[PDB]
Design a protein around this ligand. Sequence first.
Ligand SMILES: Cc1cc(Cn2cc(-c3c(Cl)cnc4nc(-c5cn(C)nc5C)[nH]c34)cn2)no1
Length: 252
Amino acid sequence: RQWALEDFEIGRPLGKGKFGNVYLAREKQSKFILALKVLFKAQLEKAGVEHQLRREVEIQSHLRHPNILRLYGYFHDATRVYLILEYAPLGTVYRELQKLSKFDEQRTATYITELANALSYCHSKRVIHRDIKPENLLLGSAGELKIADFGWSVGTLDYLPPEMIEGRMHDEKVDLWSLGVLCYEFLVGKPPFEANTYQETYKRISRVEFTFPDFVTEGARDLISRLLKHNPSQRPMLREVLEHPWITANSS
Ligand SMILES: Cc1cc(Cn2cc(-c3c(Cl)cnc4nc(-c5cn(C)nc5C)[nH]c34)cn2)no1
């Protein structure tokens, strides 16, 4: 289908930054509510990285999973490019983590399970999302977790694996790492490697240096230690993750 800007009525801005902005949009002749991520070619030619975007569009267009934000279609005028995305009713995991300060183990273990199912789906298609962080985690009408953008899929350091930040070439286990980083943050409120400088964060991720606050339970600490280790090969498969005792005992 061929789209134009004059097919959508533009509404409330949901998010800013990254040389583009998303507005809550309702299409006119069927009243469909969707999110319209609007990037500008001027700022994108200066970035000069349509490369992964055209791929990300292709990546996300035919990805059909209930825990992945569906991308409907693309179109553009001269100066800007529109990505027509599914609308997430309940917002981001980021702001909700911001408000609750921390998640109790049930909301956390549930969030992990949904991520794994979405990743096991992406891993079934040899897709690696790389940039998994709370900012691109969204919530559906039922409040289900939904993975968002794949612009950096096939910088900001905190969720990137040791092998990835150093130069050795990734594999799909880099999401197992990111999963481990997410689980920690959900329970603590902060990333395991969060630092004050890039050069310093880089070291902590490289030496794998993190410590558990005293309120994080034993079963929790176990799963995080298995996911967040230097050697990718001995990291669990998403199967082993879902069937983790602590995951099973708290997920729903
Ligand atoms: C460029 C660029 C990236 C972003 C990040 N961003 C994504 C959203 C977003 C998307 Cl893609 C889809 N559905 C959303 N629903 C919300 C939302 C709902 N509530 C109640 N509050 C918010 C926020 N955000 C969505 C927003 N930002 N922005 O520009």
